[PDB]
């Protein structure tokens, strides 16, 4: 028979057995998966950043493109209008129709537009009172005033069972969700914090990532992969006295394009570091590429050639040049 | 070369960030 | 019985609520060490409400003389050591609270400890302690 | 020693092994096989000790290799006896992909097992599963 | 993944990163004493016995091919001994790899050659300039 044809039948032969466990448990996903899902201030960022980070991507692989003339190749106005009409809120259609759609323009100002735009969603964003009360994110408070006072048989916090462990018996139970949820921005994304308090005392912190990424699986299955490797490392000798681990977060899927993911409080990426030098010292965080984008123009819009095999000179020159200025 | 310097190279050391390049 | 009820019930209507306890300290204070099994096979049943409700007061205490008081009452129930092995999790915060006071709930808490510790194995004593060897072992 | 042996799992994996390596040797000796699993079978059961997840790990890649008759998935009726699927759950990917692949009551037995007893390790996975099935094969 | 062949590529300047910004902040002293040593104890921990990691990979590997054929639309054949093939070949192309770094020299050099030749390698600013701009090799 078809596999959902079996998938139905295991998943009601589990609902015939805890029908009230399988009701909390269905009861809980849907509230989280209906009251955490984007604002249209951050889709149109990370589609913004997106198509920026793509348009940089093509012209540093065909080199040449970057001038004042060529316009716009690869077919790329499609995505741009699709983009404009479809996935963006009636507010701001005309402002960004207005400033691409209508001009037409080279891939110079295509950057230089896109790019003002990711700044100004960048700093509208990281304006917003980050901690919001926990019943905004309702019509009644299904998620405050639930569990404990709407649960029936006590689920239990996410995530694990994906552990070497022998025996459930001291697993931990949800007992109440803080008050208070974070709003946290990265590079190319944001999300929405969320905490738990355990039945003994401790509090744990998830992340619902709401635009799951397309490779979700792979990832997992590596993280599966190395999480059991780790059992040896934890056993062996030379490295047990070092604590040698890998570090491996517990993903959970919700739905096909939801998930929780655990968190650290007090995580900062390497670009948010460079991102603060540059805006401490007063310089601009995108100088490098530019310079690079534009000397790697001038120098083989000439002669490419005249160099040993591949390691052409004026690379290794304009990373010196980079690394000096 | 600069003895009890520990930023000299040598083919069994790796480079250390405070000297242009061996 | 009737005292032990009557106190936790009663406390949550009167003016001075601390009084109860005090009166509950006076009493525990009394039939510790021995001797008096009867007593210890009477309040037996009620010996998990005890340790439940001594647990939620303890959590929500703005001030170190009430917080003391529910240590020490947690801390010295009357029962025998083979009825409170089981529901020892409820001993483990006040026995971290313990262990950063005054002299005397020192000395209890270090006397508590050191009887689980001699009269427990490993492997049935290391899961209890788990939530909060941390800080138990950095007090 | 396994005709000696009462219960000692470690001459039945290292049978299984033999065959194993044996049936890999010589990409044709289906037999070799099929006794390779029902051993590993037999040494899983009596382990119980946590190192049962290798000896799953195996059965599960042997699986995979059967043939159009399901020659090796058949050493399963020539074993009897209890599965302790609790050594079996952090495979549920594995077995979620599997039951579409030539191989799905196997698979899908355990599944079954599984979920009446231990339904919170498995309810999530199956739903997102269930989903993807939804929207790919009846888009 | 290479998208022609079914074969682990990653056809880079540098074997890892490993860029000026991270060797300052780690330090001489740390980066030789620290960073170099726990890459060979890691993969002498890990491929002590050399019948362990293929065991391991077995499955990931499994999965991974499968996937790529079935992206590729252009499996027509669920042949069970090309997959058993492919699969041996990457397991052994990763067991090299981890062997590779778990090796003492023969002469009078030191233990960790074949790491120190690696981060040679991966620090040389002539090969450390060919990578993209969104890598950003400086920094």
């Given at each position: 028979?078809?596999?959902?044809?079996?998938?139905?039948?295991?998943?009601?032969?589990?609902?015939?057995?805890?029908?009230?466990?399988?009701?909390?448990?269905?009861?809980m996903?849907?509230?989280i998966?209906?009251?955490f899902?984007?604002?249209?201030?951050?889709?149109?960022?990370?589609?913004?950043?997106?198509?920026?980070?793509?348009?940089?991507?093509?012209?540093?692989?065909?080199?040449?493109?970057?001038?004042?003339?060529?316009?716009?190749?690869?077919?790329?106005?499609?995505?741009?209008?699709?983009?404009?009409?479809?996935?963006?809120?009636?507010?701001?259609?005309?402002?960004?129709?207005?400033?691409?759609?209508?001009?037409?323009?080279?891939?110079?100002?295509?950057?230089?537009?896109?790019?003002?735009?990711?700044?100004?969603?960048?700093?509208?964003?990281?304006?917003?009172?980050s901690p919001a009360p926990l019943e905004?994110f309702?019509?009644?408070?299904?998620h405050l005033?639930?569990f404990?006072?709407?649960?029936?048989?006590?689920?239990?916090i996410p995530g694990?069972?994906?552990?070497?462990?022998?025996?459930?018996?001291?697993?931990i139970?949800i007992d109440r969700f803080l008050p208070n949820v974070d709003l946290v921005?990265?590079?190319?994304?944001?999300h929405r914090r969320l905490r738990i308090r355990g039945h003994?005392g401790s509090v744990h912190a998830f992340a619902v990532?709401?635009?799951?990424?397309?490779?979700?699986?792979?990832?997992?299955?590596?993280?599966?992969?190395?999480?059991?490797?780790?059992?040896?490392?934890?056993?062996?000798?030379?490295?047990?006295?070092?604590?040698?681990?890998?570090?491996?977060?517990?993903?959970?899927?919700?739905?096909?394009?939801?998930?929780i993911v655990q968190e650290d409080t007090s995580?900062?990426?390497?670009?948010?570091?460079?991102?603060?030098?540059?805006?401490?010292?007063?310089?601009?965080?995108?100088?490098?590429?530019?310079?690079?984008?534009?000397?790697?123009?001038?120098?083989?819009?000439?002669?490419?050639?005249?160099?040993?095999?591949?390691?052409?000179?004026?690379?290794?020159?304009?990373?010196?040049?980079?690394?000096?200025? | 070369?600069?003895?009890?310097?520990?930023?000299?190279?040598?083919?069994?050391?790796?480079?250390?960030?405070?000297?242009?390049?061996? | 019985?009737?005292?032990?009820?009557?106190?936790?019930?009663?406390?949550?209507?009167?003016?001075?609520?601390?009084?109860?306890?005090?009166?509950?300290?006076?009493?525990?204070?009394?039939?510790?060490?021995?001797?008096?099994?009867?007593?210890?096979?009477?309040?037996?049943?009620?010996?998990?409400?005890?340790?439940?409700?001594?647990?939620?007061?303890?959590?929500?205490?703005?001030?170190?003389?009430?917080?003391?008081?529910?240590?020490?009452?947690?801390?010295?129930?009357?029962?025998?050591?083979?009825?409170?092995?089981?529901?020892?999790?409820?001993?483990?915060?006040?026995?971290?609270?313990?262990?950063?006071?005054?002299?005397?709930?020192?000395?209890?808490?270090?006397?508590?400890?050191?009887?689980?510790?001699?009269?427990?194995?490993?492997?049935?004593?290391?899961?209890?302690?788990?939530?909060?060897?941390?800080?138990?072992?950095?007090? | 020693?396994?005709?000696?042996?009462?219960?000692?799992?470690?001459?039945?994996?290292?049978?299984?092994?033999?065959?194993?390596?044996?049936?890999?040797?010589?990409?044709?000796?289906?037999?070799?096989?099929?006794?390779?699993?029902?051993?590993?079978?037999?040494?899983?059961?009596?382990?119980?000790?946590?190192?049962?997840?290798?000896?799953?790990?195996?059965?599960?890649?042997?699986?995979?290799?059967?043939?159009?008759?399901?020659?090796?998935?058949?050493?399963?009726?020539?074993?009897?006896?209890?599965?302790?699927?609790?050594?079996?759950?952090?495979?549920?990917?594995?077995?979620?992909?599997?039951?579409?692949?030539?191989?799905?009551?196997?698979?899908?037995?355990?599944?079954?097992?599984?979920?009446?007893?231990?339904?919170?390790?498995?309810?999530?996975?199956?739903?997102?599963?269930?989903?993807?099935?939804?929207?790919?094969?009846?888009? | 993944?290479?998208?022609?062949?079914?074969?682990?590529?990653?056809?880079?300047?540098?074997?890892?990163?490993?860029?000026?910004?991270?060797?300052?902040?780690?330090?001489?002293?740390?980066?030789?004493?620290?960073?170099?040593?726990?890459?060979?104890?890691?993969?002498?921990?890990?491929?002590?016995?050399?019948?362990?990691?293929?065991?391991?990979?077995?499955?990931?590997?499994?999965?991974?091919?499968?996937?790529?054929?079935?992206?590729?639309?252009?499996?027509?054949?669920?042949?069970?001994?090309?997959?058993?093939?492919?699969?041996?070949?990457?397991?052994?192309?990763?067991?090299?790899?981890?062997?590779?770094?778990?090796?003492?020299?023969?002469?009078?050099?030191?233990?960790?050659?074949?790491?120190?030749?690696?981060?040679?390698?991966?620090?040389?600013?002539?090969?450390?300039?060919?990578?993209?701009?969104?890598?950003?090799?400086?920094?």
């Amino acid at each position: 028979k078809p596999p959902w044809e079996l998938t139905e039948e295991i998943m009601s032969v589990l609902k015939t057995a805890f029908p009230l466990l399988a009701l909390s448990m269905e009861t809980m996903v849907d509230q989280i998966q209906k009251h955490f899902k984007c604002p249209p201030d951050e889709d149109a960022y990370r589609l913004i950043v997106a198509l920026l980070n793509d348009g940089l991507s093509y012209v540093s692989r065909m080199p040449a493109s970057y001038a004042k003339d060529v316009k716009l190749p690869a077919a790329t106005e499609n995505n741009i209008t699709r983009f404009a009409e479809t996935i963006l809120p009636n507010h701001i259609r005309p402002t960004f129709e207005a400033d691409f759609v209508k001009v037409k323009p080279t891939m110079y100002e295509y950057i230089h537009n896109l790019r003002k735009w990711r700044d100004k969603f960048e700093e509208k964003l990281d304006r917003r009172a980050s901690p919001a009360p926990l019943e905004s994110f309702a019509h009644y408070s299904p998620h405050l005033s639930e569990f404990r006072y709407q649960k029936f048989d006590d689920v239990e916090i996410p995530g694990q069972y994906l552990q070497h462990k022998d025996k459930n018996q001291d697993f931990i139970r949800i007992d109440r969700f803080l008050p208070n949820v974070d709003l946290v921005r990265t590079i190319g994304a944001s999300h929405r914090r969320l905490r738990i308090r355990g039945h003994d005392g401790s509090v744990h912190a998830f992340a619902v990532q709401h635009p799951a990424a397309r490779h979700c699986r792979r990832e997992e299955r590596v993280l599966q992969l190395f999480r059991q490797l780790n059992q040896t490392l934890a056993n062996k000798k030379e490295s047990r006295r070092r604590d040698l681990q890998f570090t491996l977060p517990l993903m959970v899927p919700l739905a096909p394009h939801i998930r929780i993911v655990q968190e650290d409080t007090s995580y900062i990426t390497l670009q948010s570091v460079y991102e603060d030098h540059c805006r401490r010292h007063g310089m601009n965080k995108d100088e490098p590429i530019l310079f690079t984008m534009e000397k790697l123009r001038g120098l083989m819009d000439a002669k490419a050639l005249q160099k040993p095999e591949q390691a052409v000179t004026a690379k290794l020159e304009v990373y010196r040049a980079i690394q000096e200025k | 070369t600069v003895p009890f310097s520990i930023h000299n190279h040598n083919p069994y050391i790796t480079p250390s960030p405070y000297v242009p390049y061996p | 019985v009737d005292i032990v009820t009557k106190s936790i019930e009663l406390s949550t209507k009167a003016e001075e609520p601390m009084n109860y306890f005090l009166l509950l300290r006076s009493l525990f204070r009394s039939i510790g060490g021995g001797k008096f099994e009867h007593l210890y096979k009477q309040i037996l049943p009620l010996l998990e409400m005890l340790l439940d409700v001594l647990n939620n007061l303890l959590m929500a205490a703005r001030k170190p003389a009430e917080r003391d008081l529910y240590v020490e009452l947690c801390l010295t129930v009357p029962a025998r050591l083979s009825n409170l092995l089981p529901h020892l999790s409820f001993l483990m915060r006040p026995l971290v609270v313990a262990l950063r006071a005054g002299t005397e709930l020192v000395g209890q808490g270090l006397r508590t400890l050191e009887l689980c510790v001699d009269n427990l194995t490993a492997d049935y004593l290391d899961p209890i302690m788990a939530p909060v060897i941390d800080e138990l072992m950095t007090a | 020693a396994l005709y000696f042996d009462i219960t000692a799992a470690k001459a039945w994996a290292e049978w299984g092994y033999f065959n194993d390596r044996k049936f890999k040797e010589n990409p044709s000796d289906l037999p070799s096989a099929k006794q390779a699993l029902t051993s590993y079978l037999q040494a899983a059961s009596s382990y119980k000790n946590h190192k049962s997840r290798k000896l799953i790990a195996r059965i599960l890649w042997l699986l995979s290799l059967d043939d159009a008759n399901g020659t090796i998935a058949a050493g399963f009726d020539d074993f009897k006896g209890e599965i302790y699927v609790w050594w079996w759950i952090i495979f549920i990917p594995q077995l979620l992909v599997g039951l579409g692949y030539k191989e799905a009551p196997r698979v899908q037995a355990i599944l079954l097992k599984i979920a009446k007893t231990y339904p919170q390790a498995l309810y999530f996975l199956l739903r997102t599963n269930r989903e993807d099935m939804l929207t790919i094969k009846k888009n | 993944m290479a998208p022609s062949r079914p074969l682990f590529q990653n056809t880079e300047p540098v074997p890892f990163r490993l860029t000026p910004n991270l060797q300052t902040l780690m330090g001489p002293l740390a980066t030789e004493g620290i960073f170099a040593a726990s890459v060979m104890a890691i993969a002498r921990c890990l491929t002590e016995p050399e019948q362990h990691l293929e065991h391991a990979l077995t499955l990931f590997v499994r999965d991974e091919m499968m996937f790529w054929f079935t992206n590729s639309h252009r499996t027509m054949s669920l042949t069970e001994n090309q997959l058993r093939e492919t699969v041996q070949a990457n397991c052994d192309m990763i067991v090299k790899k981890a062997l590779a770094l778990a090796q003492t020299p023969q002469g009078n050099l030191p233990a960790h050659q074949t790491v120190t030749d690696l981060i040679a390698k991966a620090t040389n600013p002539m090969n450390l300039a060919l990578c993209d701009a969104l890598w950003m090799p400086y920094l």
